[PDB]
Design a protein around this ligand. Structure first.
Ligand SMILES: O=C(O)CCC(=O)C(=O)O
Ligand SMILES: [Mn+2]
Length: 203
């Protein structure tokens, strides 16, 4: 589906790769654990996060940043799993962005009730690169708007395996996730995971 200029939803695109992706999420988290962070605004996130790849995103009360080192372990974030690399390249190509080279993958874990408030991904220096966003596990309602905070929002259920890509005209569009409804999924048990691939450094 034609989500917006430069944006698409590839439904169930990652469904066959999901089992492998979740195993790799568990491997990454065994090294750099999921943690709920606090924003510079003083807001404690309900979504727990970790990262893999060259750069990882983290935040605390004094600011946020993309760094090659996990501040909790003082060790590099785990390397990008091959399954992650392969799926991201396939999805980016299917979405019309074949030259996307991510150097960062943020892994979000949503327990029941967790949400991610409406925001823009504007922390990356090079906005020419798209965002590739993978849904795994329990279903969630994704909000996708426009360039301005008050632009009308589309509300779309994202299910296990769905992939959403945005860029170009829609690169800075506002988006978010509504509180996750509780339930059971065989592969993730009681949660929704998301993989957010980005080019966060200079290229
Ligand atoms: O979980 C999602 O589908 C969205 C994640 C997201 O927007 C982000 O991490 O910036
Ligand atoms: Mn985002």
């Amino acid at each position: 589906e034609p989500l917006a200029a430069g944006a698409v939803i590839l439904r169930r695109f990652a469904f066959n790769a999901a089992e492998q992706l979740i195993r790799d999420i568990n491997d990454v988290a065994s090294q750099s654990p999921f943690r709920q962070m606090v924003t510079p605004g003083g807001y404690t996130m309900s979504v727990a996060m970790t990262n893999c790849g060259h750069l990882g995103w983290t935040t605390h009360r004094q600011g946020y940043l993309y760094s090659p080192i996990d501040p909790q372990t003082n060790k590099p974030w785990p390397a990008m799993p091959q399954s992650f690399h392969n799926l991201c390249q396939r999805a980016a190509t299917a979405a019309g962005y074949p030259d996307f080279q991510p150097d960062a993958c943020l892994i979000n874990r949503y327990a029941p009730g967790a949400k991610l408030s409406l925001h823009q991904d504007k922390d990356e220096p090079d906005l020419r690169a798209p965002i590739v966003s993978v849904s795994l596990g329990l279903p969630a309602i994704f909000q996708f708007g426009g360039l301005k905070r008050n632009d009308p929002l589309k509300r779309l259920l994202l299910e296990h395996g769905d992939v959403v890509v945005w860029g170009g005209e829609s690169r800075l569009f506002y988006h978010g996730i509504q509180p996750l409804k509780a339930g059971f999924h065989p592969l993730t048990i009681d949660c929704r995971y998301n993989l957010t691939f980005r080019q966060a450094g200079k290229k």
